[PDB]
Design an enzyme around this catalytic site. Structure first.
Site, PDB file in Angstrom:
ATOM      1  N   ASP A   1       0.846  -1.191   0.000  1.00 41.81           N
ATOM      2  CA  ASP A   1       0.000   0.000   0.000  1.00 41.81           C
ATOM      3  C   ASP A   1       0.872   1.227   0.000  1.00 41.81           C
ATOM      4  OD1 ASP A   1      -1.790   2.124   0.459  1.00 41.81           O
ATOM      5  OD2 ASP A   1      -2.210   1.493   2.542  1.00 41.81           O
TER       6      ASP A   1
ATOM      7  N   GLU B   1      30.746   7.693   8.651  1.00 39.79           N
ATOM      8  CA  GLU B   1      30.893   7.463  10.085  1.00 39.79           C
ATOM      9  C   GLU B   1      29.617   7.883  10.793  1.00 39.79           C
ATOM     10  OE1 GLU B   1      34.541  10.110   9.215  1.00 39.79           O
ATOM     11  OE2 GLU B   1      34.619   9.510  11.323  1.00 39.79           O
TER      12      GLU B   1
ATOM     13  N   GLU C   1      27.743   8.138  13.862  1.00 38.99           N
ATOM     14  CA  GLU C   1      27.878   8.145  15.309  1.00 38.99           C
ATOM     15  C   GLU C   1      26.486   8.006  15.920  1.00 38.99           C
ATOM     16  OE1 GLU C   1      29.725  12.031  15.224  1.00 38.99           O
ATOM     17  OE2 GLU C   1      31.673  11.250  15.799  1.00 38.99           O
TER      18      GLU C   1
ATOM     19  N   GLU D   1      32.603   7.681  21.815  1.00 36.72           N
ATOM     20  CA  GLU D   1      32.823   9.012  21.264  1.00 36.72           C
ATOM     21  C   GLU D   1      32.841  10.097  22.350  1.00 36.72           C
ATOM     22  OE1 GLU D   1      33.281  11.440  19.053  1.00 36.72           O
ATOM     23  OE2 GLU D   1      34.061  10.205  17.408  1.00 36.72           O
TER      24      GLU D   1
ATOM     25  N   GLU E   1      30.838   5.138  18.119  1.00 34.09           N
ATOM     26  CA  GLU E   1      31.064   5.130  16.689  1.00 34.09           C
ATOM     27  C   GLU E   1      31.621   3.769  16.280  1.00 34.09           C
ATOM     28  OE1 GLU E   1      34.052   7.290  13.429  1.00 34.09           O
ATOM     29  OE2 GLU E   1      33.267   8.500  15.092  1.00 34.09           O
TER      30      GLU E   1
ATOM     31  N   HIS F   1      29.936  11.924   8.904  1.00 30.62           N
ATOM     32  CA  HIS F   1      30.972  12.364   7.981  1.00 30.62           C
ATOM     33  C   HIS F   1      31.009  11.420   6.788  1.00 30.62           C
ATOM     34  CE1 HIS F   1      33.077  13.539  12.005  1.00 30.62           C
ATOM     35  NE2 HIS F   1      32.123  14.402  11.706  1.00 30.62           N
TER      36      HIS F   1
ATOM     37  N   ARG G   1      39.310  19.497  12.142  1.00 33.76           N
ATOM     38  CA  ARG G   1      38.000  19.006  12.597  1.00 33.76           C
ATOM     39  C   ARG G   1      36.964  20.105  12.920  1.00 33.76           C
ATOM     40  NH1 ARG G   1      41.063  14.295  13.304  1.00 33.76           N
ATOM     41  NH2 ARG G   1      39.842  12.358  13.324  1.00 33.76           N
TER      42      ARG G   1
ATOM     43  N   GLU H   1      36.845  14.610   3.338  1.00 32.27           N
ATOM     44  CA  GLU H   1      35.842  14.288   4.351  1.00 32.27           C
ATOM     45  C   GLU H   1      34.814  15.421   4.472  1.00 32.27           C
ATOM     46  OE1 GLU H   1      36.708  14.766   8.489  1.00 32.27           O
ATOM     47  OE2 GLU H   1      35.687  12.922   9.062  1.00 32.27           O
TER      48      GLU H   1
ATOM     49  N   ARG I   1      32.149  16.907   6.376  1.00 30.89           N
ATOM     50  CA  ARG I   1      31.794  16.762   7.795  1.00 30.89           C
ATOM     51  C   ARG I   1      30.392  17.268   8.152  1.00 30.89           C
ATOM     52  NH1 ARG I   1      35.910  15.359  11.302  1.00 30.89           N
ATOM     53  NH2 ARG I   1      34.812  16.375  13.046  1.00 30.89           N
TER      54      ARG I   1
HETATM   55  C1  LIG Z   1      39.547   4.478   4.727  1.00 33.60           C
HETATM   56  N1  LIG Z   1      38.445   5.081   3.923  1.00 33.60           N
HETATM   57  C2  LIG Z   1      37.235   5.399   4.408  1.00 33.60           C
HETATM   58  N2  LIG Z   1      36.785   5.200   5.815  1.00 33.60           N
HETATM   59  C3  LIG Z   1      37.125   6.346   6.656  1.00 33.60           C
HETATM   60  C4  LIG Z   1      36.874   5.856   8.082  1.00 33.60           C
HETATM   61  O1  LIG Z   1      35.504   5.450   8.216  1.00 33.60           O
HETATM   62  C5  LIG Z   1      35.148   4.404   7.313  1.00 33.60           C
HETATM   63  C6  LIG Z   1      35.358   4.915   5.889  1.00 33.60           C
HETATM   64  N3  LIG Z   1      36.497   5.916   3.408  1.00 33.60           N
HETATM   65  C7  LIG Z   1      37.244   5.933   2.284  1.00 33.60           C
HETATM   66  C8  LIG Z   1      38.487   5.402   2.618  1.00 33.60           C
HETATM   67  C9  LIG Z   1      39.471   5.293   1.624  1.00 33.60           C
HETATM   68  O2  LIG Z   1      40.599   4.815   1.896  1.00 33.60           O
HETATM   69  N4  LIG Z   1      39.194   5.698   0.373  1.00 33.60           N
HETATM   70  C10 LIG Z   1      40.207   5.621  -0.674  1.00 33.60           C
HETATM   71  C11 LIG Z   1      40.177   4.369  -1.516  1.00 33.60           C
HETATM   72  C12 LIG Z   1      39.187   4.154  -2.478  1.00 33.60           C
HETATM   73  C13 LIG Z   1      39.197   2.993  -3.258  1.00 33.60           C
HETATM   74  C14 LIG Z   1      40.218   2.062  -3.072  1.00 33.60           C
HETATM   75 CL1  LIG Z   1      40.317   0.550  -4.037  1.00 33.60          CL
HETATM   76  C15 LIG Z   1      41.203   2.288  -2.132  1.00 33.60           C
HETATM   77 CL2  LIG Z   1      42.504   1.068  -1.949  1.00 33.60          CL
HETATM   78  C16 LIG Z   1      41.196   3.440  -1.349  1.00 33.60           C
HETATM   79  C17 LIG Z   1      37.929   6.249   0.068  1.00 33.60           C
HETATM   80  O3  LIG Z   1      37.690   6.630  -1.099  1.00 33.60           O
HETATM   81  N5  LIG Z   1      36.984   6.345   1.026  1.00 33.60           N
HETATM   82  C18 LIG Z   1      35.667   6.896   0.701  1.00 33.60           C
HETATM   83  C1  LIG Z   2      35.861  12.944  17.162  1.00 35.98           C
HETATM   84  S1  LIG Z   2      35.003  13.572  15.875  1.00 35.98           S
HETATM   85  O1  LIG Z   2      35.757  14.645  15.298  1.00 35.98           O
HETATM   86  C2  LIG Z   2      33.577  14.188  16.480  1.00 35.98           C
HETATM   87  C3  LIG Z   2      32.545  14.554  15.418  1.00 35.98           C
HETATM   88  C4  LIG Z   2      31.278  15.151  16.040  1.00 35.98           C
HETATM   89  N1  LIG Z   2      30.543  14.146  16.796  1.00 35.98           N
HETATM   90  C5  LIG Z   2      30.354  15.733  15.003  1.00 35.98           C
HETATM   91  O2  LIG Z   2      30.632  15.671  13.790  1.00 35.98           O
HETATM   92  O3  LIG Z   2      29.297  16.262  15.401  1.00 35.98           O
HETATM   93  N2  LIG Z   2      34.752  12.495  14.840  1.00 35.98           N
HETATM   94  P1  LIG Z   2      35.964  11.696  14.005  1.00 35.98           P
HETATM   95  O4  LIG Z   2      37.294  12.004  14.642  1.00 35.98           O
HETATM   96  O5  LIG Z   2      35.519  10.266  14.096  1.00 35.98           O
HETATM   97  O6  LIG Z   2      35.856  12.246  12.609  1.00 35.98           O
HETATM   98  C1  LIG Z   3      -3.488  -0.789   4.673  1.00 34.73           C
HETATM   99  S1  LIG Z   3      -5.100  -1.154   4.489  1.00 34.73           S
HETATM  100  O1  LIG Z   3      -5.574  -0.454   3.324  1.00 34.73           O
HETATM  101  C2  LIG Z   3      -5.896  -0.608   5.860  1.00 34.73           C
HETATM  102  C3  LIG Z   3      -7.366  -1.048   5.944  1.00 34.73           C
HETATM  103  C4  LIG Z   3      -8.049  -0.510   7.214  1.00 34.73           C
HETATM  104  N1  LIG Z   3      -7.487  -1.105   8.424  1.00 34.73           N
HETATM  105  C5  LIG Z   3      -9.540  -0.734   7.209  1.00 34.73           C
HETATM  106  O2  LIG Z   3     -10.109  -1.341   6.276  1.00 34.73           O
HETATM  107  O3  LIG Z   3     -10.175  -0.290   8.173  1.00 34.73           O
HETATM  108  N2  LIG Z   3      -5.328  -2.650   4.287  1.00 34.73           N
HETATM  109  P1  LIG Z   3      -4.706  -3.548   2.995  1.00 34.73           P
HETATM  110  O4  LIG Z   3      -3.700  -2.689   2.282  1.00 34.73           O
HETATM  111  O5  LIG Z   3      -4.132  -4.747   3.699  1.00 34.73           O
HETATM  112  O6  LIG Z   3      -5.881  -3.870   2.100  1.00 34.73           O
HETATM  113 MG   LIG Z   4      35.424  11.700  10.751  1.00 34.11          MG
HETATM  114 MG   LIG Z   5      35.818   8.506  12.878  1.00 28.07          MG
HETATM  115 MG   LIG Z   6      33.577  10.460  15.289  1.00 32.53          MG
END
Ligand SMILES: Cn1c(N2CCOCC2)nc2c1c(=O)n(Cc1ccc(Cl)c(Cl)c1)c(=O)n2C
Ligand SMILES: C[S@](=O)(CC[C@H](N)C(=O)O)=NP(=O)(O)O
Ligand SMILES: C[S@](=O)(CC[C@H](N)C(=O)O)=NP(=O)(O)O
Ligand SMILES: [Mg+2]
Ligand SMILES: [Mg+2]
Ligand SMILES: [Mg+2]
Ligand SMILES: Cn1c(N2CCOCC2)nc2c1c(=O)n(Cc1ccc(Cl)c(Cl)c1)c(=O)n2C
Ligand SMILES: Cn1c(N2CCOCC2)nc2c1c(=O)n(Cc1ccc(Cl)c(Cl)c1)c(=O)n2C
Ligand SMILES: C[S@](=O)(CC[C@H](N)C(=O)O)=NP(=O)(O)O
Ligand SMILES: C[S@](=O)(CC[C@H](N)C(=O)O)=NP(=O)(O)O
Ligand SMILES: [Cl-]
Ligand SMILES: [Cl-]
Ligand SMILES: [Cl-]
Ligand SMILES: [Cl-]
Ligand SMILES: [Mg+2]
Ligand SMILES: [Mg+2]
Ligand SMILES: [Mg+2]
Ligand SMILES: [Mg+2]
Ligand SMILES: [Mg+2]
Ligand SMILES: [Mg+2]
Ligand SMILES: [Mg+2]
EC number: 6.3.1.2
Lengths: 476, 476, 476, 243
Positions: free
Chosen positions: A52, A131, A133, A217, A225, A274, A345, A364, A366
């Site tokens: 639906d 990322e 969080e 975090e 995270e 991020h 950051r 990145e 952010r």
């Molecule tokens: C470590 N990392 C993260 N992480 C950062 C930490 O949080 C998880 C994602 N995101 C990345 C990367 C990251 O390394 N890269 C580069 C990248 C892209 C393709 C290939 Cl085949 C390779 Cl070997 C590397 C990227 O292009 N991106 C988007």
């Molecule tokens: C430690 S933080 O900088 C904190 C990020 C924050 N919570 C925010 O983006 O709002 N994140 P990270 O080092 O994982 O990128």
């Molecule tokens: C999502 S609903 O349309 C809701 C019907 C309602 N409870 C009634 O007939 O009163 N039912 P369905 O999609 O299962 O036919």
């Molecule tokens: Mg980050």
């Molecule tokens: Mg991080």
């Molecule tokens: Mg973080």
């Protein structure tokens, strides 16, 4: 490259009892219904299944309700939580008459974005690393009435509890609670969530995620995270949705409650999403130039130019809630203006220190949070970056300082982040051409989004008196 | 035309023990300290009295703290509440070196506005009649913490209490509570505040107010209104401040608590401060023309043109709080757009039905509330009206319909009221020349006001998560 | 025949502090605001006073809000309750432009009805004697939510409390409670309300009522009845409104709470408003004929014919609420069908036993209740009676039987009373010509009434599940 | 018959799985005010000699004459039919606008605001069917399914034509457009009255007999309609305590 028969084999080998059919609504919550294993056949792949559309947000009206679903075999995973063995699969939404992909299926937008990228010749792959969080709370309650309104979140490790006589269950207060801005990242017993985060890490591993790290975090009251390996746009968005499901339900099964909202605590860190981004072509990286600032190529720098130029409207998809803008305040490692800077950051785009390896080069972004739709957010970011490359948009010079502590006269000469959601929605309405390129976003999607946010979010908050207005104004 | 010796005689005849020295801070709260009757002499009139200007909002910095006060004998009244016989007098703030009137004394602004009017030749008297509505509550509490925030107002007559097992003191629920939007104005016992309002009416009469009426208002939970005779600008603003004092303290002495905040209840009427206005010259009325729409002269129509044209900035002084804009929503007899219309309680300016008597002709500016400063609000309204007359600003045609029920396409072709305080403050900053005419408002006042609202009101509310954001977003 | 100067003299002699200006809304609740004695002058009589017609039910829309009030000196009485000496006066509602009487002022309808009667030549005076019964409760509470709803009334003398361990204040259960259908009328201590009813009787006497009797009524939990002398239509309706005010507020001041609702208790007597009626001309009675059944003349019998013939639509004004139809059930001395009968308390019209004195001859219309508007109810009754006389409508033969004990096949052969409010409203819509004779009722009144009942009463009750539906259907 | 037997057992299994697991289930039509009611939509089709009869490629929503006349019978007989398909006082709290239940007597494809919806099933003739959205679970599936069939069969036999399909949100129709459409009954007493007045289609072939119909009418009046009518509603106290 999984096939229908690969999934049927997985279902048989795992002795699956049920299949959970999943798809994404427009705001960004996954929807589901369950069919028995006996009803999971080739007809599911050939004909699809109905639902639906009028009960799903941003979808159909009541007189045009019936919609169709077609499986994506790449997304088949065993559910870690259900006692009855269950296989989860994501689906694409299709028109029930023409079998054409739905213009307001978020998973379709991601599909279209990927194909448009290829069609530009600029690259063939956009990699997204995210990322997301979150807070591991113990409880939450809230209401809204004619004569009053409240919210309260709570957690054993919250600093607001240091003076508590006992814990919620009546057991002694044993100290070791987390100071505001002090959660990143002392060892246990300060870190009260080590075992729970291990269970989250294990549930992810057992769902085919490639894991990188997990930690507490900055925020008091259980901020966390976890990082998993990046992937291409659509896969990465699918990963995000499943990750949030696994985090939320590991917590739930273990007596906790998780939120991904941008700013649940006042005066402590918000939760961001991020997005590390890079473009590749023919198996080669495109972001690296030894001679550029922060080792960035022209393609990379123009992608950043696009992100920072389009931000005033882009944030409608990357920071899509009223709560989003309570996070975009100074002092909490979230952006307050539109600058890129390496190692920084406090910046809107940080360039991580990765060395001379060209493969590791990336930006990145952010600004984004987890309060919306990763399919739409990743796609919108890509469209902004591509418009930047295509029009060779130059970002303004990097600012390598604490952007929160800028002198007032330098701070004014830099574009700020938007103040509130109504501003970015207004701006999206006025200027969204970069999104409609190649038909990746269509006008019906953009207009539905704008309408939804105004009627269901912006206006409902605007008409309701804020508790702080009583602190300020009761005695006027 | 009261003199120093008139006040000394009043003090002696009434056997006054204390004199309460009063003056107005910038936001709009009256300030006071007490001197004994023995210290109330000619030196108070000749030399004045000192205070700490740095502890008063919108006044001095700490190194330039000392300020001076000089009495206004017109404002001497016996206090109805203090057990020790007390005489209240309002004062003007002066520079302690030059004895010049202070540029940020609200009572000075009103003085200057009146003199500027005379200097234009347009009229010699501006009459202000005001209706300051209020809520008679039983209790209020609120806070704001890192992990939660709340407010709650309560009243025996609140509809939210119909299902209560007992009253707050443990006595039985006896029904006859007020329905939402249903308080205007059934007889007792539905009206549970008759005797208390009589005490308010009597305290006003005994303070030299000329009374016209008192009644329960539309809102559930004890909304009320009392009307006293209009007067010239400064006198009327002085009347307003004393009226609020008498209402608040009659309530306090009788076990209740009153608020003049614009919107304490969600989904029920807000509390407005409608301002009836007319200009007179040489003892003759200027607002009447038998042949004009709603019997209005050119002078009157242009005054309205000024009010509606300057509204986007004028509301910074007439609707000066964040809470103000929770009242400017449709369905509650408050304005949502900038139109004038006779007999129309949905309009921004209503023309009351007064007949063919030229003396009774006037406009009702329905936009203002009681959440700020009547000296500044009345003055700003006058300056806008005068700019309208001087530049012959024509208001757009009257719309004689339910303005809440306008078809979307007609509704769009009419200027709306501002959405939020930050918008009117921004607009005040950009365009305030009409206010600075004749030096009635000065730039230091306007800049102080803008700065105060941003730092102390707009920003503090913006950074604090709203309870409804948890209703909307906890599960994102 | 009181004059403006008579009222001014009364106000001066009584040393009145306030004047309470009163008028009737459409459903039937008196509305009020207060002016000080000093503002009560000839201008009140000459020019009148204004109010917001859009806040009063069945009156104006928001863009045509201003309305006017003009005093009725006949209705001036001293208020028995207010500590500050107050004089109450009823007003007529008038158009603020033309000064013409308002078509939807209930007091105007009664005025018009009386003048129409004179214009027919049939009679010059219609006398109405009413018995407004009521319950003296201790407490009431009720609500309506998404997942639940409740009501509860309570009274010390309620039979449901015979097993209570203590009274509400913790004092001992001392017995002597009233059995269901057993309140009429044992001596004290069974009758627990003797002193309170004496206070009601005294307050009425001191307000210029001519009293006849007071007693406890049939219903458990404090049912009561007080009778005052009959009067001509308009005076009688004014008397009813003031009587209800005095009853309600004597109770309130003495720790109790009164309801005039038709059926607050299930399985015990409802509260009716029987209306004794007679027509007089040139100081001579018209209802008596020694040779007629129950001593009734042709004029009287045709008046009854009119009442019983028009009942299906007439009850829309005489039994105007959803709750009205919970009282019209067998076994409780209220009508269940359309018959007249002498001495018969189970009948629709009873002819009281009055003997051979022609002056005392009258009909008792037992169908009406106190849940609406006496001005409209008395007027509609008169219009039905007059249509009966004019068209010489013959009532069906009197039935001198206990009408609750008829076997169902014999019950069926007599027209029944309407089952529910929606039926009488439908019938009023289809046939209301007798009411619009002489313009006594106008189409705008009838259409407003129909619309109000449907939108505000019938529909709100229909959409809300009844508690007994859960008793019947939870386990379906 | 098998389908009605299945329904009864299904309700038993649902209720008792819940019970054994600490919960409590209700099939009542409208237990919540201001949220969706619980319906019992009945998909229906007629077959003969192993072949489907509801499909015609050229009809509106791909419906044959037989199918369209079956719908004609359902919508024509609704005023009395609802006595067996919507048989409780609570049934009529569900028949209000805004909750995907019917408020008037129209058929329409893809339309969840309609009385009969035609599901989108494509060109496969076997899948062709109507969804009668009016019924709920508050009564008897044996009687309800049977009464629906008798109404549909009277429609086929007398070739009753349904009024034209209305392909709109039926809660949002402009004042005078909605007014040209027959509404669903307001309350149980109305459908029982109508059943009493006109029930010949049910007595065809002696499927329903007069003693059954008379017992049903009598039961509903004495045990349901009257007991609710005499009991004051809590909302009457909200409206009327202070009259
Ligand atoms: C470590 N990392 C993260 N992480 C950062 C930490 O949080 C998880 C994602 N995101 C990345 C990367 C990251 O390394 N890269 C580069 C990248 C892209 C393709 C290939 Cl085949 C390779 Cl070997 C590397 C990227 O292009 N991106 C988007
Ligand atoms: C430690 S933080 O900088 C904190 C990020 C924050 N919570 C925010 O983006 O709002 N994140 P990270 O080092 O994982 O990128
Ligand atoms: C999502 S609903 O349309 C809701 C019907 C309602 N409870 C009634 O007939 O009163 N039912 P369905 O999609 O299962 O036919
Ligand atoms: Mg980050
Ligand atoms: Mg991080
Ligand atoms: Mg973080
Ligand atoms: C009744 N009223 C109110 N009240 C409206 C109800 O609330 C109290 C103020 N405000 C008024 C008036 C009001 O009447 N007038 C006109 C006016 C001005 C001067 C003179 Cl000498 C005279 Cl006789 C009349 C006015 O000019 N203003 C401003
Ligand atoms: C006793 N009574 C009551 N009461 C019945 C008991 O409750 C109070 C009203 N209502 C009456 C009467 C009542 O007696 N009459 C007749 C009537 C009319 C006019 C005159 Cl001048 C005279 Cl003397 C008598 C009447 O015409 N009506 C309407
Ligand atoms: C009845 S009302 O229209 C209500 C005004 C509303 N409280 C407001 O201005 O917000 N006021 P009035 O009739 O006293 O001018
Ligand atoms: C004793 S009774 O017959 C009771 C009337 C009942 N309360 C009713 O009309 O609902 N009234 P009365 O004798 O005062 O006419
Ligand atoms: Cl916003
Ligand atoms: Cl703001
Ligand atoms: Cl009804
Ligand atoms: Cl019914
Ligand atoms: Mg007023
Ligand atoms: Mg008012
Ligand atoms: Mg007003
Ligand atoms: Mg009696
Ligand atoms: Mg009686
Ligand atoms: Mg009687
Ligand atoms: Mg269905």
């Amino acid at each position: 490259e999984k096939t229908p028969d690969d999934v049927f084999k997985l279902a048989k080998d795992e002795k699956v009892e049920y299949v959970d059919v999943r798809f994404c609504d427009l705001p960004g919550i996954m929807q589901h219904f369950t069919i028995p294993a006996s009803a999971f056949d080739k007809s599911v792949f050939d004909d699809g299944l109905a639902f639906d559309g009028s009960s799903i947000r941003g979808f159909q009206s009541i007189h045009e309700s019936d919609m169709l679903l077609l499986p994506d075999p790449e997304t088949a995973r065993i559910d870690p939580f259900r006692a009855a063995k269950t296989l989860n699969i994501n689906f694409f939404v299709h028109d029930p008459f023409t079998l054409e992909p739905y213009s307001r299926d978020p998973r379709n937008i991601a599909r279209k974005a990927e194909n448009y990228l290829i069609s530009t010749g600029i690259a063939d792959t956009a990699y997204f690393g995210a990322e997301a969080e979150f807070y591991i709370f113990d409880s939450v309650s809230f209401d809204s009435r004619a004569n009053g309104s409240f919210y309260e979140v709570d957690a054993i490790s919250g600093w607001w509890n240091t003076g508590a006589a006992t814990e919620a269950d009546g057991s002694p207060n044993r100290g070791y609670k987390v100071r505001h801005k002090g959660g990143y990242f002392p060892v246990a017993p300060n870190d009260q969530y080590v075992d729970l985060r291990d269970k989250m890490l294990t549930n992810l591993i057992n769902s085919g995620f490639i894991l990188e790290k997990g930690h507490h975090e900055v925020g008091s009251g259980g901020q966390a995270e976890i990082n998993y390996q990046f992937n291409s746009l659509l896969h990465a968005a699918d990963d995000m949705q499943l990750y949030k499901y696994i985090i939320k339900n590991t917590a739930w099964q273990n007596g906790k409650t998780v939120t991904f909202m941008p700013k649940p605590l006042f005066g402590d860190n918000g939760s961001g999403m991020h997005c590390h981004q890079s473009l590749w072509k023919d198996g080669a990286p495109l972001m690296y130039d030894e001679t550029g600032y922060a080792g960035l190529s022209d393609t990379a720098r123009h992608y950043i130019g696009g992100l920072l130029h389009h931000a005033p409207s882009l944030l409608a998809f990357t920071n899509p809630t009223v709560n989003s803008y309570k996070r975009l305040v100074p002092g909490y490692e979230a952006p307050i203006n539109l600058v890129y800077s390496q190692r920084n950051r406090s910046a809107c785009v940080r360039i991580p220190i990765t060395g001379s390896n060209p493969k590791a080069k990336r930006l990145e972004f952010r600004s984004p949070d987890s309060s919306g739709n990763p399919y739409l957010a990743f796609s919108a970011m890509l469209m902004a970056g591509l418009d930047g490359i295509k029009n060779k948009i130059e970002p303004q010079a990097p600012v390598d300082k604490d952007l929160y502590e800028l002198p007032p006269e330098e701070a004014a000469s830099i574009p700020q982040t938007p103040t509130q959601l109504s501003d970015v929605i207004d701006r999206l309405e006025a200027d969204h051409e970069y999104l409609t390129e190649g038909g990746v976003f269509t006008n019906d999607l953009i207009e539905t989004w704008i309408s939804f946010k105004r009627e269901n979010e912006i206006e409902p908050v605007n008409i309701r008196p804020h508790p702080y207005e009583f602190a300020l104004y009761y005695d006027v």
